[PDB]
Each structure stands twice: as structure tokens, then as C-alpha cells.
């Protein structure tokens, strides 16, 4: 029998390397054999644990083997996963090998506001065609924005829960305090004045005028009550750079509602102003639902 | 929350639960993984319970079994949950595979009982009884010679 | 190899072959013999070839006497041998065997499709039809091959059943098929009489006019020009049919589709299925943008308030939705002052 | 092959070979003592004296040390090993632990071991050390070898999958994937985990990969385990063509180039070959003097008066055709002779299963048939088992 790192088959032999570590994205075929025998070593991305094997088993989702024939493949460390390709390639849209469309694996997409002040259901559309987690023939790729892996060898990236978010990295992160760093293992809460209600987001959303977010990591914005109002005119949502898929401009909303001043009152809930009430009525307290 | 079955956490203040190794299992939140009982097996690394080796098979350990192996050809295992303590033979335990009895035989590896040696037919109305030479054997010869 | 009939022959078809020889070291002429799997005819009388070069000789079997008609369906092994002398004990030098599949004539098989199959999305409009000219048939199995390009493989075998009641049409459904590339394809339907081996009873390929065309739904350009944006329920909204455009930006041979327009109001029905400006069921979808119709503009006044999705859709034969363009109109009677 | 890691218990195994092995009839094996100085200066706190036998014999005996006592990772160790009768290769293992990354020069010594006393240098020349290659310890990697971890319970969007069924695999996409077949594009705002059918030729039971079938097996698309080609036929996988561009749906991973599709991948062995096993991989040529049909789960022997050779000019040639060998398997299985031919006149053959013995260099030696001639006074007719 062949040793437990090699295989011998009648119909094929040799191995094909990973195309995601080359320039033109073409697997490079080599023929490495174990010295004491003739059996060929397993290709990168596969492994052979036992002795007599005709084919090399591909590694499962969450593991990787980046060298020729190996007895077993290791688990991807936290902060990295086993999606096919690299992160700068999973996110890219510009090809360099025209005959191959190589360095564009449109495997990352997201919905959001874009520069035609327009909402966009998935910014990267089309039929996904690079969706592979089993055969990982290189080092594990860093997580895409909005996803995290906290333990070794998770099969798939998990998405951040609605109240939290995960930026691209620390430098390009939106509202995120001084000491906090992002490495792909921790989803951070949304600051006060910001909310988030969707899964796997790279940025929080700004609370609109007439609403506030007093707590941290709110899945929904609180609505101002009669006798109060919030009017933050600089609050805005992040706009997604359609070329790099990274959102930039976020300004948080209000943390607490402003009570109506003396002589003014407000009766509707979601509003941005106070109305002075007419003749015959007065308001001698701040925050009156009806004078 | 407590660690789910198949996971454990021996430290305080952590945010993840580590997975149990082969031969061990764990129920809901537990500090450590408990070794499989004697005679039962667990091969994966997220096992929530240990399954017992079936009749005709034996566990390849006295405490933490990782694979149920078939009995050899000269042996038979009648009991479910048979294990192999390493003190005696390799394929022999208190409930593990036993040698076939002195005048019985078995040839298939995983068998739940040995079969008696058949008489040898030479012609009409004459049968030569057949015996076995050793204790654990897989073929019978005429008992006269 | 056979040239004969381009499609597989039947028991009522005569097969004509083509065979050439070439040697890279020798040049002396040899004598060739051709034998059919008929079982009744004998080996052809030994006849010489020309001088042998590296270039293969012309068709040695091109004469009119090298023909055969098979009386039974199945696989017939046609063999060709090379000797040196024309006498019986002459030494054999080479031999070549080729299979010829003769199909049944009493069984007619057709493959009918409902709508246009899009790209990688699944397609479930295919179904097959079998009609036997004779009485009860035994069990049958059918396979479908999506294209003849290399790397495209014949599917598994689907149990049809039996066809007992003479020349009645028996229909069977074909599992969902996925096409990897857009453009024209040559899908073939084959029918055998065994689950694993057996005889090739029939093959069917749609004619050049009915060939399958896989369409790419992201290449459909739709230009919808509904009238004014956010309005009131008293404001008339217009849909100009001479400015709205539909086109296919990949090729000029795509199948035609119908269009429909929805006002997103329950008071009015959506328009019936209609063709583009002047095309009919025998035309193709135009690559250059064309007006949807030459009629006058259509006006409508909404009966409620809110946000409405006035939409234009492209349907196919099976009433699938291939492409769709939505223009949003916000109706609201907000600012109205009465003194 | 030469350098260890840092702050990781590293085990040095030394293998000793003795030219005349200890006789199996020896009353006892031959004992040796291996002394190692790791080159570090942690535990003994001082490098030893000059490199001689007189100082290396002093190293403490740590043969039966455990991991608990302080001398387990001691830097100057002596371990006693024994060569059992019949053997002649032995090995001694030293545990070490290198706390820094500086260069190190370990030294090794072998001595003959008398009754609890270290003898002379085992290389029989004067004080010879075995200087290992100097090295610099690197940093220990922290990767874990094992299978995938099924994630614990987390909030997920409706449709996100973390486990697939049998015959399916987990993929990362934002399209719609029902029953393993894509039915719509962009059904989710963000990519989620979907279950996609395994391709024909592969099978799975965990749902995290599509494992191609081993040789001798085949399967259809959604199979959860491969099936074996029956006896007499071998499974030839069909050749795949890799996708032209990276904007095209792939079939499997980039390293998979042949797949064994449905039952059409079982091809019969040719004439003259046979294959008895129920999951067969190669066609075995018939044994010398035996013949077989196309199916050929077994062979039959040429009868008396007949010898096994090629029947090119006979009435019923039994050799395989070009279609059965070259158009089906390629150049792997060529055409071989499997006919039984009659003995000539005045020659007899009394045994079954005999073959014309071949000659590959036809100029010097010619091929010979094993047809015995009849003795004087006996004639025999043709293809006979005995003379008259
Ligand atoms: C960044 O991007 C964010 C993307 O989500 C975006 O969040 C969205 O913001 C919009 C507002 O711009 C949220 O709209 C929702 O509209 C509902 C109705 O709004 C008004 O309703 C009135 C109904 O009439 C009643 O009330 C009026 C007085 O208010 C009274 O006069 C009548 O008599 C009636 O009694 C109507 O007249 C007005 O015309 C408006 O249409 C609100 O009720 C919503 O409140 C929400 O309720 C949701 C229930 O699930 C809850 O999920 C929300 O958290 C919230 O409590 C809300 O105002 C939209 O919901 C929101 N998206 C989500 C999913 O939260 C941000 O606005 C954007 N940020 C910035 C700064 O641009
Ligand atoms: C996916 O497709 C099925 C059937 O076409 C449909 O019922 C289901 O709602 C779709 N899922 C999503 C997320 O749109």
C-alpha cells in the first residue's frame, strides 16, 4: 500500500496547485512523488490520512491544506475562514487576466445606500459562481465585513446579530472608540444615537429626526413621545463606495429627546419641532403634551 | 448560557466552548468531557453521547473507545457493548470476542455465534463426524484423523 | 466511420461508410476488406488500395457497391481489415471496428419545451413524448443531453414506463436542467430500452428553427417612461408607449417575448400579453432598442394613496418572468388649502 | 528536518546500527548508553568540561524519569537502551525544551553498557562525539489538526444554514438555492449559507464537502454514498474540462479532473482479461494457459490437445477487438491472445492449460509451443491427448 500522504490511481496522477496564489489564476501542474515508492503526493487542498488510497479526500469546510500531500489538514484560526480565494479577491470586481476574469470573484455583496442618493439591493448583482469552502488550497482568508469566527475551524463565517456590526478594519471603521480594535472575532455594539436592524452589517444606521437611541446596540430606534422632539440635521447614513464596497459617512443621531420649551407644546409623537399654542392657552412647564 | 452537548469549558470568564475530543462526550454545560463508559464508542469530536458496540464487534479500548472493530475469524462476540482490555489477548475481554469452542468454528469476522462442525458425507447413510484441532479455528477436519 | 445518413440509420436506411489508410514507414499497396455486422452478407472481395503515404488515402469505400441495409435494430459492428495478398492464407496486417447504431422506426419520440430557459437558474419546461406505431412496448428509459460541446455529459436515465395503447401519445416529465452558458444549444433526447445498457431505440434533436436558446436575463435593457412622479389622486399619470423600449444586448437571435404593464391599482387590470412594436411570433428579440407599441399614450388616475410600483414585465411562452422594470409613483393628497 | 521549535517539548530520537546483529540465540541483548548534551545551559547552569568520555560518562541516568520530576528536561542526560536478540537496530529518545532562540550545538555519545557500568566509547575509536547540525529555534505554530466544528447556537437570518444533509454541501452565496438547485438570483441582501447538491461522481455524509468516489465506485448527483461496479467491469471516470472563465458555474474543486458518473462508467474488461472482485480497479490478464469471454469474472483452461495462443486464422478468433480495448480504455489494456489451438499431427499434449512460450527477441530465440512429439512407434492424429 501507498504511504498515508500519497495516492496512486490508474487514470490520473500528479497534482494541480492553487490558482489563487498565482498571477493569471491558472493551476500549475506538478508531479511530486514519494521517494521510497512511486505514489504521487496529494494536491494542495486535499489530504490522505490512511495507507491505501486511490483518491485524495478534499478537506472539509473550515479546514485547509496548502502544501502537497499531507496526512491531515488544520483548522482555520479565529478571524479567518476557508472560503475559496483571498479576501482582496473575494471582494474584487476588476479583472486583470482578460481570458480568465481571474482576480474578480464576486463572492461578496451587500445592500445599502449609494452615491445616486439611491438605495441598492445587492450592490454586486449577478449569479454567484465562487461559493466553495471545502477545498482550501492556501492560507485561510480574513473574514468579509459583517462576519466573524470566534473558534477554530468554523465551516462558514457567521453574521453579526442585528444590534452589532463589524467594520472592514480599524482605520476604515465608522463610529468606533479609541481603544477598540477589530480583528474579525468580535462584533461591536452600535453607539448611542445609532441603531442596526439587519444581519451582517459593516456599519450601524443613524437614527432619523424624530427618534433617538438612548441605549447601546439597539435593534430599533426609539420614537419621541408627545411633549418632546429630536431634530439632528447632520445625521446621515453611510454611503457605500461602489468600487471598494466600503461605507464612509456616518453621523449619529440623538441620544435623548428635547422637551418642548416653556410656552410651547407638542402633541404628535414622531416630530422635529414644537408649536406655540394659540390665544387663550398657556404652557408654563417644559415638555407638555398639550398646553 | 451553558455549553451545549459535545462542548466543554474549564475556564471562567470565557466566551466560547471548546469541543470534546474523540472517545469523550458531554451533555449540557459541563466543565470537562466525560470519558465514554467501558464497551461503548465515540469517534467524532462533537459527540453528545457514546454508542455501544454492536453484537459481533468490540471497542478498541477499555475506557475511551474510538472505533468498533470486528472480531477476528476464529472468534465470536455474542454480547453488545463488548470491549477489549489489553491484559489478555488483543482480541479478548470480559465481554469481548471469545475463541470459538473446541469443536465449533467460524470463518466470517463479525459473527454472533460459532457454528458446529458438519459431518462429512462420503456416500449413502454414512457420515464421518468432524472435530477441530485447536481452540479458535475456522475450519473442521474429519475427527478420526 | 459511417457517413451514410448523418443521423443514426433505421432498418429502412442504407449506410455508406468512409475508410482511409496511411502508413508512416511503408509504401507498398495492400488489399482491404470491409465486413458488416449484418450476419448474412460475407466479407467484401479483396481489393487493392493506392500507394500508402503519411497522408491518408482517399475514401476507398466511396463506390456504390459498398452499401448495406440492416433488418434488426441495435448495435452493428462494422470491421475493416488489411491483408497483403488476395489469396485466403494471406497474412492479416491490421483491423478496425466501429459501431453503427440502428434505431427503431415504429417508435416516434419528441421533446417539447414550454418557455425560454434562462441562465444558471433552473429550467422545468421540458417534457418528452413517445408514440409507438405498434402495440404494447416494454419498459423504456430516457436521457437528455444539454449540448454537444466537450465536457457536457448525457444525463441519467429516467423511467418512462410502457406505451400499450398503440399510437397514443405518452408524456413524461424531465427533471430541472441548468445551463452554464447563454446562446444557442443542441439539446438531444435519447430513448433506450434498458436501465444500464441495452439498445438505443431513438434519438430526437429539435430542428434548426426550434433549437434551444439559453437567454441571459441581465442583458435585457428595459426603458420604462411613465409620466409624472409623485402626484395627487386628481393628477393624471401618463404612460407613453412610443418612448418605452425593450432590447436584448447580447445577440440578435434570441427568442421573442411578450410584454405586460401593470399600474399597481386594483381598479384596472394589467394589459394583455402583446408583442413589441412590429414583431410577431416568428421574429426574434431586437438588439437595437425598439418602442413597445405604436399606440397612443395611456392615461390613468389613481384611486388610492401611498406608493405604487408601475411595472413593465417581459413574459415568455410558459408565463415566466424574464425581465422587469419598476417606476415608483407616490400619490398623496397632502397639500390642499381650502378657504 | 534539523531545527526544533521554541518553548515546545522536543524529542530527539537517535538510531544505532550494529553490523553483525545480536544472534537470536543470545542469552540477552546488548546494552548501550546514550549521553546527550543539548547545548543549552538552563538546568545544569554550566556547560560541561572539555569534550571527552571522562565527563560525558558522568551525566545522570534519567531512563525511568516522568514528566513531573525536575530532571525530565535536564540538559545533560544519559539513557540506557538494550538490543534484543534478533534485532540490531536500536534507538534512544531524549526529551528537551529549548527556552531561547540562540544557536545551539548539541553533542552525542554512545558507550557500551556493562552490568550497571558505562564502558568505553561504542565507536571503538578514541573520544568521538557526534556533532549535530547547529540550529536556531523558530516560533511554534498554533494551528489545530482536526475536523470542522459545528457552530453552537447563534441568531441567524431566515434561510442561513450551518449544516447540510447527506448528498449536499455548504456554499456561501446570496442567490436562492432550493433542493440544491439554483432557482433565483439575489434572493438575499447579503451572502448566506446554502446547501447545494453534490455533483454526479461524488458523495458525502457530513455535508461540508463533496468527496469524489474511490476507484471502483460510481454515483449519481445527490448520492450520499457511492455504489460498486459489479464483478467483470471496472469503473472508468469521465474526463472533466475545467471552466473557461471565473464567471462560470463550476462543477467541483479545481484539483478534481476525473469523475465517475452514473452506471455508464462501468466498462467491461476485454477478452483475455478478467476481474472477480465486486469493487474492481484493474483488469487482470488471464493466467498463462487460460481463456475468457467479455464479461470474464473468471477464466477457463485450454483442454487437452490444445495450447493457448492467438487464433488469428482460426474459425472463431477469440481476441478482443479495437473497439473493446483502444476505444474504451485507451492504451492501458492492449489486445492479448486468448484462443486455444489444436496440436499438429504426430504431436500430443496431455495436460490442461498450456501456452506457446513467447520470445521477445525473435532473432536469437523463436517462440515455442509445448506440443510433445509422439514416441517412436506411435502416430496420433491431430490435437490429441495421447499417441496410438
Ligand atoms: C438611515 O437608514 C435607515 C434604513 O432603515 C433609516 O431607517 C428608516 O427610517 C425611516 C424614516 O425615515 C423609518 O420609517 C418608519 O416610518 C413609520 C411611519 O412614518 C410616519 O408615519 C406616520 C403615520 O401616521 C401616524 O402617525 C402620525 C404622526 O407620526 C400621525 O399624524 C397619524 O395620525 C398617525 O397616527 C405618517 O403620517 C408619516 O407620513 C410617516 O410615514 C414610523 O412609524 C416608523 O417607526 C418605526 O416603527 C418600526 C416598527 O417595526 C420600527 O422598526 C422602527 O424602529 C420605528 O420605531 C419609522 O419612522 C424606517 O422604519 C427606518 N427603518 C427601520 C427598519 O427602522 C434611517 O431613517 C436613515 N437615517 C437617516 C438619518 O437618514
Ligand atoms: C427561493 O425559492 C423558493 C421557490 O422558488 C421560494 O418559495 C422561496 O421563497 C425563495 N426564497 C427566498 C429567500 O426568496
Automatic annotation (TrEMBL), chain B:
Where in the chain are disulfide-linked cysteines found? 3-17, 20-33, 36-50, 53-68, 71-97, 100-114, 117-140, 131-143
Q: Which residues form the Tyrosine-protein kinase ephrin type A/B receptor-like domain?
A: 1-26
Give residues annotated as binding alpha-D-galactose 3: 79
Which residues bind alpha-D-galactose 4 per the record?
Answer: 95
Domain of life, per UniProt, equals Eukaryota
Residues in the signal sequence = none
Descriptive protein name: Tyrosine-protein kinase ephrin type A/B receptor-like domain-containing protein
Full-protein positions shown? 1698 to 1842 of 1987
Amino acid at each position: 500500500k501507498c504511504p498515508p500522504g500519497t495516492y496512486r490511481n490508474t487514470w490520473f496522477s500528479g497534482q494541480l496547485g492553487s490558482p489563487f496564489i498565482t498571477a493569471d489564476g491558472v493551476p500549475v501542474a506538478t508531479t511530486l512523488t514519494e521517494l521510497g515508492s512511486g505514489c504521487s503526493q496529494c494536491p494542495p487542498g486535499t489530504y490522505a490520512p490512511t495507507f491505501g488510497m486511490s483518491v485524495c479526500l478534499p478537506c472539509p469546510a473550515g479546514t485547509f491544506a496548502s502544501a502537497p500531500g499531507a496526512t491531515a489538514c488544520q483548522q482555520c484560526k479565529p478571524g479567518t475562514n476557508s472560503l475559496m480565494g483571498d479576501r482582496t479577491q473575494q471582494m474584487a470586481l476588476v479583472v486583470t487576466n482578460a481570458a480568465n476574469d481571474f482576480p474578480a470573484l464576486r463572492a461578496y455583496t451587500i445592500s445599502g445606500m449609494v452615491a445616486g442618493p439611491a438605495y441598492a439591493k445587492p450592490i454586486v448583482t449577478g449569479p454567484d459562481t465562487n461559493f466553495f469552502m471545502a477545498g482550501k488550497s492556501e492560507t485561510c482568508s480574513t473574514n468579509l465585513p459583517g462576519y466573524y469566527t470566534d473558534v477554530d475551524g468554523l465551516p462558514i463565517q457567521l453574521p453579526c446579530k442585528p444590534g452589532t456590526f463589524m467594520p472592514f478594519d480599524t482605520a476604515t471603521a465608522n463610529l468606533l472608540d479609541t481603544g477598540l480594535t477589530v480583528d474579525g472575532t468580535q462584533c461591536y455594539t452600535c453607539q448611542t444615537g445609532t441603531f442596526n436592524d439587519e444581519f451582517s452589517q459593516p456599519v450601524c444606521k443613524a437614527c432619523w429626526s424624530g427618534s433617538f437611541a438612548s441605549k447601546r446596540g439597539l435593534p430599533t430606534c426609539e420614537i419621541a413621545q408627545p411633549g418632546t422632539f429630536t431634530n439632528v440635521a447632520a445625521a446621515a447614513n453611510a454611503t457605500f463606495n461602489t468600487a471598494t464596497l466600503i461605507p464612509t459617512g456616518l453621523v449619529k443621531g440623538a441620544q435623548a429627546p428635547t422637551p418642548c420649551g416653556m410656552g410651547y407644546f407638542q402633541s404628535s409623537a414622531e416630530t422635529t419641532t414644537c408649536t406655540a399654542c394659540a390665544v387663550g392657552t398657556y404652557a408654563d412647564q417644559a415638555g407638555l403634551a398639550a398646553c | 448560557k451553558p455549553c451545549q452537548p459535545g462542548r466543554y469549558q474549564n475556564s471562567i470568564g470565557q466566551r466560547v466552548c471548546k469541543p470534546c475530543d474523540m472517545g469523550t462526550y458531554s451533555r449540557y454545560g459541563g466543565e470537562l468531557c466525560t470519558k465514554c463508559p467501558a464497551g461503548t464508542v465515540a469517534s467524532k469530536t462533537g459527540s453528545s453521547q457514546c454508542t455501544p458496540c454492536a453484537a459481533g464487534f468490540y471497542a478498541n479500548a477499555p475506557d475511551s473507545a474510538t472505533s468498533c472493530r470486528a472480531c477476528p475469524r476464529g472468534y465470536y462476540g455474542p454480547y453488545s457493548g463488548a470491549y477489549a482490555d489489553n491484559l489478555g489477548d488483543e482480541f479478548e475481554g470480559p465481554r469481548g470476542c471469545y475463541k470459538c469452542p473446541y469443536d465449533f468454528f467460524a470463518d466470517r469476522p463479525g459473527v454472533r455465534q460459532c457454528t458446529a462442525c458438519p459431518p462429512l458425507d462420503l456416500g449413502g447413510g454414512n457420515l464421518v463426524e468432524q472435530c477441530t484441532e485447536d481452540l479458535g479455528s475456522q475450519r473442521c477436519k474429519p475427527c478420526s484423523l | 466511420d459511417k457517413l451514410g445518413p448523418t443521423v443514426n440509420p433505421t432498418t429502412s436506411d442504407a449506410v455508406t461508410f468512409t475508410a482511409t489508410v496511411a502508413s508512416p514507414d511503408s509504401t507498398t499497396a495492400v488489399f482491404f476488406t470491409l465486413d458488416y455486422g449484418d450476419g448474412v452478407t460475407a466479407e467484401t472481395t479483396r481489393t487493392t488500395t493506392g500507394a500508402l503515404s503519411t497522408t491518408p488515402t482517399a475514401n476507398l469505400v466511396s463506390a456504390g457497391t459498398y452499401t448495406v441495409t440492416y433488418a434488426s435494430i441495435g448495435t452493428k459492428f462494422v470491421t475493416l481489415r488489411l491483408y497483403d495478398s488476395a489469396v485466403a492464407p494471406g497474412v492479416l496486417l491490421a483491423s478496425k471496428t466501429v459501431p453503427i447504431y440502428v434505431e427503431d422506426s415504429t417508435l416516434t419520440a419528441t421533446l417539447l419545451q414550454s418557455g425560454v430557459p434562462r441562465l444558471n437558474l433552473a429550467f422545468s419546461g421540458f417534457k418528452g413524448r413517445v408514440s409507438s406505431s405498434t402495440a404494447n412496448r416494454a419498459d423504456m428509459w430516457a436521457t437528455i443531453q444539454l449540448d454537444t460541446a466537450p465536457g457536457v455529459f448525457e444525463s441519467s436515465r429516467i423511467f418512462i414506463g410502457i406505451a400499450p395503447t398503440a399510437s397514443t401519445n405518452y408524456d413524461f416529465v424531465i427533471p430541472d436542467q441548468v445551463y452554464n452558458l447563454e446562446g444557442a444549444k443542441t439539446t438531444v433526447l435519447r430513448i433506450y430500452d434498458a436501465p444500464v445498457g441495452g439498445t438505443l431505440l431513438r434519438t430526437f434533436t429539435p430542428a434548426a428553427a426550434n433549437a434551444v436558446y439559453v437567454v441571459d436575463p441581465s442583458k435585457y435593457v428595459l426603458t420604462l417612461t411613465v409620466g409624472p412622479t409623485s402626484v395627487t389622486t386628481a393628477d393624471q399619470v401618463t404612460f407613453t408607449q412610443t418612448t418605452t423600449e425593450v432590447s436584448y444586448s447580447a445577440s440578435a437571435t434570441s427568442p421573442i417575448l411578450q410584454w405586460r404593464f401593470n399600474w399597481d391599482d386594483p381598479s384596472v387590470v394589467e394589459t394583455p400579453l402583446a408583442y413589441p412594436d412590429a414583431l410577431t411570433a416568428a421574429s426574434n428579440f431586437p438588439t437595437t432598442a425598439t418602442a413597445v407599441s405604436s399606440a397612443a399614450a395611456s392615461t390613468f388616475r389613481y384611486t388610492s394613496t401611498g406608493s405604487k410600483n408601475a411595472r413593465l414585465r417581459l413574459y415568455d411562452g410558459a408565463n415566466n418572468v424574464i425581465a422587469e422594470k419598476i417606476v415608483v409613483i407616490t400619490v398623496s393628497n397632502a397639500g390642499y388649502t381650502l378657504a | 528536518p534539523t531545527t526544533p521549535y521554541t518553548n515546545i517539548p522536543t524529542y530527539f530520537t537517535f538510531t544505532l546500527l550494529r553490523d553483525p546483529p545480536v544472534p537470536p540465540s543470545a542469552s540477552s541483548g546488548v546494552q548501550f548508553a546514550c549521553a546527550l548534551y543539548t547545548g543549552q545551559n538552563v538546568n545544569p547552569a554550566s556547560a560541561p568540561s572539555a569534550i571527552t568520555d571522562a565527563v560525558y560518562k558522568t551525566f545522570t541516568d534519567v531512563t525511568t524519569a516522568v514528566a513531573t520530576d525536575a530532571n525530565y528536561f535536564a540538559d545533560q542526560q544519559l539513557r540506557v537502551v538494550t538490543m534484543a536478540p534478533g534485532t540490531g537496530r536500536v534507538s534512544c529518545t531524549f526529551p528537551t525544551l529549548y527556552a531561547a532562540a540562540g544557536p545551539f550545538s548539541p553533542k552525542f555519545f554512545v558507550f557500551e553498557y556493562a552490568s550497571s557500568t558505562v564502558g568505553a566509547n561504542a565507536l571503538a575509536v578514541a573520544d568521538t562525539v557526534t556533532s549535530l547540525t547547529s540550529f536556531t529555534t523558530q516560533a511554534a505554530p498554533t494551528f489545530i489538526t482536526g475536523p470542522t466544528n459545528v457552530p453552537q447556537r447563534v441568531p441567524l437570518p431566515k434561510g442561513f444554514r450551518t449544516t447540510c444533509f447527506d448528498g449536499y454541501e455548504l456554499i456561501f452565496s446570496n442567490d436562492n438555492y432550493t433542493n440544491g438547485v439554483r432557482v433565483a438570483v439575489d434572493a438575499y441582501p447579503y451572502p448566506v449559507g446554502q446547501c447545494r447538491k453534490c455533483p454526479g461522481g461524488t458523495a458525502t455524509m457530513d455535508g461540508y464537502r463533496c468527496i469524489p468516489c474511490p476507484s471502483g465506485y460510481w454515483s449519481n448527483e445527490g448520492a450520499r454514498e457511492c455504489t460498486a461496479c459489479p464483478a467483470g467491469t471496472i469503473a472508468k471516470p469521465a474526463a472533466l474540462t475545467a471552466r473557461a472563465k471565473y464567471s462560470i458555474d463550476p462543477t467541483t474543486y479545481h484539483f478534481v479532473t476525473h469523475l465517475a458518473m452514473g452506471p455508464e462508467s462501468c466498462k467491461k474488461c476485454p477478452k483475455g482479461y478478467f476481474q472477480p472482485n465486486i469493487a474492481g480497479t484493474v483488469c487482470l490478464p488471464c493466467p498463462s494457459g487460460f481463456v475468457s469471454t467479455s464479461g470474464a469474472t473468471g477464466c477457463t483452461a485450454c483442454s487437452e490437445g490444445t495450447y493457448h495462443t492467438d487464433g488469428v486464422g482460426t474459425t472463431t478468433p477469440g481476441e478482443a477487438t479495437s473497439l473493446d480495448t483502444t476505444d474504451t480504455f485507451g492504451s492501458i489494456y492492449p489486445i492479448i491472445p486468448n484462443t486455444c489451438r489444436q496440436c499438429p499431427a504426430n504431436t500430443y499434449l496431455p495436460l490442461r492449460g498450456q501456452a506457446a512460450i513467447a520470445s521477445m527477441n525473435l532473432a536469437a530465440v523463436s517462440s515455442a509451443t509445448p506440443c510433445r512429439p509422439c514416441e517412436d512407434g506411435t502416430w496420433s492424429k491431430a490435437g490429441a491427448a495421447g499417441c496410438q
